[PDB]
Amino acid sequence: SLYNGRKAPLRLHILIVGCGLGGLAAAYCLAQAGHRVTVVEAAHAIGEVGAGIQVTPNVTRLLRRWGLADAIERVAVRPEAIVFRRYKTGERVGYTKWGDKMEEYGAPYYHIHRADFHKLLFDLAAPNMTLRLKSTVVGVDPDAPSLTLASGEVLHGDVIIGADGVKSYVQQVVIGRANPAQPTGDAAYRAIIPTSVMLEDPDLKPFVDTPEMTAWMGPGTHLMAYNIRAKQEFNMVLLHPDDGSVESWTAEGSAEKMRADFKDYEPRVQKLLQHVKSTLKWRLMDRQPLEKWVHSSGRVALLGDSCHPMLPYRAQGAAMAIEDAAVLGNLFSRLSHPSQIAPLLHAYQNLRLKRTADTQASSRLNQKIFHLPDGPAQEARDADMRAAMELEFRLLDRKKNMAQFGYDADAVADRWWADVGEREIGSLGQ
Numbered sequence: 262s263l264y265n266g267r268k269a270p271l272r273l274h275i276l277i278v279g280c281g282l283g284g285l286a287a288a289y290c291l292a293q294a295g296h297r298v299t300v301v302e303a304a305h306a307i308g309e310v311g312a313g314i315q316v317t318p319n320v321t322r323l324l325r326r327w328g329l330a331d332a333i334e335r336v337a338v339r340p341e342a343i344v345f346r347r348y349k350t351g352e353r354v355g356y357t358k359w360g361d362k363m364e365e366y367g368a369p370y371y372h373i374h375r376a377d378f379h380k381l382l383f384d385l386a387a388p389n390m391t392l393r394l395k396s397t398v399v400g401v402d403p404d405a406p407s408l409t410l411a412s413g414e415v416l417h418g419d420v421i422i423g424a425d426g427v428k429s430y431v432q433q434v435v436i437g438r439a440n441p442a443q444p445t446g447d448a449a450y451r452a453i454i455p456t457s458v459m460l461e462d463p464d465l466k467p468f469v470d471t472p473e474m475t476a477w478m479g480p481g482t483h484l485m486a487y488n489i490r491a492k493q494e495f496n497m498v499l500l501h502p503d504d505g506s507v508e509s510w511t512a513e514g515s516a517e518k519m520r521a522d523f524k525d526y527e528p529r530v531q532k533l534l535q536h537v538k539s540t541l542k543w544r545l546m547d548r549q550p551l552e553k554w555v556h557s558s559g560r561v562a563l564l565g566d567s568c569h570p571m572l573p574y575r576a577q578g579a580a581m582a583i584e585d586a587a588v589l590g591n592l593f594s595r596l597s598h599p600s601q602i603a604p605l606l607h608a609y610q611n612l613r614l615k616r617t618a619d620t621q622a623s624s625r626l627n628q629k630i631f632h633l634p635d636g637p638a639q640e641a642r643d644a645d646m647r648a649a650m651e652l653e654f655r656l657l658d659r660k661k662n663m664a665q666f667g668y669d670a671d672a673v674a675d676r677w678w679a680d681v682g683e684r685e686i687g688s689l690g691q
């Protein structure tokens with residue numbers, strides 16, 4: 262029971278465009294808040310798709326609140342540390358202890374396969390939503406409001422939530438255009454190998470025995486690797502200069518070109534990439550924060566990657582989409598009169614926008630540091646990492662980590678409601 266058992270005295274029909282991690286989180290939170298939810302999804306079925314997702318303590322805190330504590334512990338992995346390595350030799354130049362140290366933010370840091378994460382949120386939301394698959398939204402009347410599907414079917418609701426991802430259709434209706442996207446010059450390969458083949462190699466086995474997030478830093482390139490799916494699968498993300506790619510979750514890369522691009526990395530990376538049977542490739546595109554997330558009619562708003570997508574350096578996409586849902590559901594649990602619908606959507610945006618813009622920036626400002634060419638700049642980064650690492654080992658920015666990881670979406674919305682919203686929004690209609 263979320264919201265201390267409270268249900269909005271005014272029950273809405275809310276249409277959610279997109280059955281991704283955001284849309285499912287929104288469907289769960291808004292149904293719990295006392296609203297009728299329909300989720301409309303383009304995909305014909307939910308598939309075994311996607312790769313590793315970061316579940317930082319600020320996300321885990323909410324998933325535990327939603328009753329998922331055992332189910333996530335079962336399928337996700339708790340990384341013990343983040344380790345930075347020189348590409349060529351595998352020298353460990355950096356180390357930050359995670360594991361139990363992450364519990365000081367009030368919940369564990371998990372690594373999860375997107376499909377396992379999707380399944381957890383799907384099973385939560387499914388009993389309290391109507392899901393329409395094979396239903397591409399191709400039009401929005403933001404005044405009614407209503408949605409138009411590719412079939413021409415029109416769906417009516419009180420509120421439309423656009424959770425339709427990085428290439429949101431709803432975003433174009435809210436803002437009046439697609440948010441400009443600028444190529445960074447880089448692409449990412451994503452590839453998964455079974456950990457059974459690593460356990461068979463005495464040089465690779467320790468990567469399964471002691472689950473870490475390892476970043477090998479190279480000239481123009483990096484390889485980030487970690488266990489998912491209860492250490493049955495090893496997730497690898499490889500950043501490299503864009504030699505032709507598209508911004509799509511289904512676009513393929515050449516495993517042979519991937520191996521060629523990383524041929525100068527240490528022998529354990531050669532052995533890891535030898536097991537890659539296939540790889541998907543994504544063109545990195547930089548997007549700025551939106552000016553607003555709410556349409557001028559106050560009945561359509563955005564959630565998740567539709568309004569704050571970010572680069573894979575600090576992939577907090579899932580985190581920010583789930584936080585968005587928790588705050589939106591918290592505010593909507595308060596609704597008692599139609600005159601409050603717009604103010605509540607404005608409050609949602611007001612509580613979320615700067616935080617998510619700062620989180621996009623945190624990812625954006627990590628693009629060059631792991632890709633330095635060999636030389637003075639590279640040796641100074643390694644030296645700075647070593648200094649920090651040696652303190653970590655003697656025991657055997659933190660304030661930014663606390664601002665990200667210690668965040669409680671419900672606490673922020675409960676406090677705003679108590680200090681301001683009850684008086685300024687709750688009284689509307691009296």
Ligand SMILES: Cc1cc2nc3c(=O)[nH]c(=O)nc-3n(C[C@H](O)[C@H](O)[C@H](O)COP(=O)(O)OP(=O)(O)OC[C@H]3O[C@@H](n4cnc5c(N)ncnc54)[C@H](O)[C@@H]3O)c2cc1C
Nearest residue numbers: 279281282283303311312397398425426510565566578579
């Ligand atoms: C198939 C898939 C695979 C992914 N794999 C990865 C990955 O490996 N690593 C990673 O970092 N991130 C991945 N992502 C993105 C990741 O889910 C997000 O960055 C974030 O975790 C959650 O954001 P979101 O729910 O706002 O958007 P998304 O997860 O992108 O979900 C948006 C949903 O909206 C649907 N949709 C889009 N347009 C319409 C429309 N017009 N009408 C109806 N439905 C529509 C899409 O089909 C999708 O299911 C993937 C997304 C998808 C859809």
